[PDB]
Amino acid sequence: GWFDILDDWLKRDRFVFVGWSGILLFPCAYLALGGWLTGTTFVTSWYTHGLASSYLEGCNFLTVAVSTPANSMGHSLLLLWGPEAQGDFTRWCQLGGLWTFIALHGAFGLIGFMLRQFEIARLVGVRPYNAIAFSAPIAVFVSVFLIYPLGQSSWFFAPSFGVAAIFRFLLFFQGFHNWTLNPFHMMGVAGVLGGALLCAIHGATVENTLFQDGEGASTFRAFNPTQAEETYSMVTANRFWSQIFGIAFSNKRWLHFFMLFVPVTGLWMSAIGVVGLALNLRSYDFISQEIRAAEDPEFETFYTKNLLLNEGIRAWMAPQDQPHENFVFPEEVLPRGNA
Amino acid sequence: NLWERFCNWVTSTDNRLYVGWFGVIMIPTLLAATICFVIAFIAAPPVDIDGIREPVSGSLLYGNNIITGAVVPSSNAIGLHFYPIWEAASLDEWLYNGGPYQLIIFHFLLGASCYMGRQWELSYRLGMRPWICVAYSAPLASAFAVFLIYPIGQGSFSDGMPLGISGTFNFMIVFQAEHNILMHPFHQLGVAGVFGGALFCAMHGSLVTSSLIRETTETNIVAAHGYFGRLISRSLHFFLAAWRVVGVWFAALGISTMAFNLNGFNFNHSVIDAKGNVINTWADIINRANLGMEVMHE
Amino acid sequence: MEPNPNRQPVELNRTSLYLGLLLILVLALLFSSYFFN
Amino acid sequence: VNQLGFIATALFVLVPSVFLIILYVQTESQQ
């Protein structure tokens, strides 16, 4: 009656599936992408950062951004009705309200997209392993775009929805946090690089040890949800990799559980690292190497080489990256090499 | 006479580990580079890299851990010279100039090339296509570009990547200072390749374990699959391997051409208004952060 | 009286032992430098 | 410089790994 005629209209067959979770997903994903495109086309960063970051100014694709709000805004939600915008659209664009528009819609659209995977797996009747694998980009998005700036002073220290702004975010985290020395980050690099290696090896050895190679290959019935994972011999690939590498998979199910498990654990570990760096609990200094470098000045390792390069990043990027602090650094306090 | 028992032990496909003809070169070179890596990581004298006497101690016994320990590259007084033990005067002079780095990378690159040859040889003798060898050639090109092509293009073996955990981050920071690798597109295709390879690994491994119900062997490869997907050819594995492979090939030949100082077309919008006033862009924050490390490296 | 029919035995093969020993050992190899400091 | 950081390393090894080996030989009696 009331509820059922809506429920089988939503779960009807169509071009796209628009379930009950499509009501959450399609406005939120649409307004996140629309906010990012109208921010990179028209909206500037001149009053929050002091930067020119739009196609209206002259920036290309690699240089536009929808920039973070200014540091004086705090962790304000920057609603358009607001205490800061007061209904005004132009000031809400100039204060950085489009950043909070894209980030809150990114949050609710990722919620709706992981709900749509549950909805699609529920009517097909499969186990929702794709929705569990998508809990790692949701963890990365919440730990980087939500938990990290909420542990900091304001939304200013947050990635600013652009290519060069994300490169600034990477170089900031090397300089101020020593983020490559964090072990949770090292697990993240291990997960992503090993997941790329896993999918390269796996696609290289399915297409090599096929059942029907090229001669009598009468094409059998292909099923879309099988993912063509029934066109190779697990015996032949196991017999190869037991001789080349020594260890090998003996399962078509544990292989793909390992293929799920490796980069999702990598992204979850790096999310735990950024959640620690939200309160500046960073793995910056080994204490024994600090005392052993302060003891004798002839003790140089690659670690003490790296701490000086981080000091160079900090004191040379900080008067322009954080302009609200009004850093006046003369030339004689900047860390140079011959000093 | 007996040379036939050895020749069929090498050519045997029933061993526990396959010892090919490329394995006959691969085993001693990789064992020599392995034993010298484990020795020079634990106990090694400090190595000067510059001409001045400020040596970088990278061994474990000279006050390092797993993270900060490294086999330090060879000095600037060597450069592109071949440096075995018998070219040096003393053994202490060989370790002070950083000969173990040249030893480890030369035997390692020989043995990794022969490991590629061993995969080709087992695929040839099992009568198979060369898709494992071609997919292995992307880490092989990325280990040639980092260890050999970049020290040849920079003119000295000191510029190469050190063999240690914190030494790779020092290499990457100095590379971002000198070359601005993040804004060059051949590196962004490598980030797209590695990120998408992780993505396709997670999505492919989730979607197969969702719809693979049971499987068995003889002791025939029976497999029941939960088919029927969503509503309105099958070389998905060629895309699944070829996406990450050509992604890593692009950044391998990318830093191979950054070796010879062929910086890609910079996208630097230097916006200046008519009063002589400077309007900053986000590439200027990255360029300031690169200038802060180039001056730090001297 | 009856000896609790809700009890199933616990399995751990040699390969899950090898993967677990590999995980615990390389986690200790990664984290020992930070525990020592 | 930590003395019990050596202890926290060994309890990082000796507490889980023993739990694996005890779980291994317990199913070598079942079979």
């Binding site: 020594g246 | 634990i42 | 040699r14 190899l29 020992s32 | -």
Partner: peptide, 30 residues
């Protein structure tokens, strides 16, 4: 005391490489 700790944890992985390559489990046959 730290150096032999790192070398001992590395050598246990090197021994587990041998015990997983050669002493791998036989497949369950039916």
């Amino acid at each position: 005391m730290e150096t032999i700790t790192y070398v001992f944890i590395f050598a246990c992985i090197i021994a587990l490489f041998f015990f997983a390559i050669f002493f791998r489990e036989p497949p369950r046959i039916t």
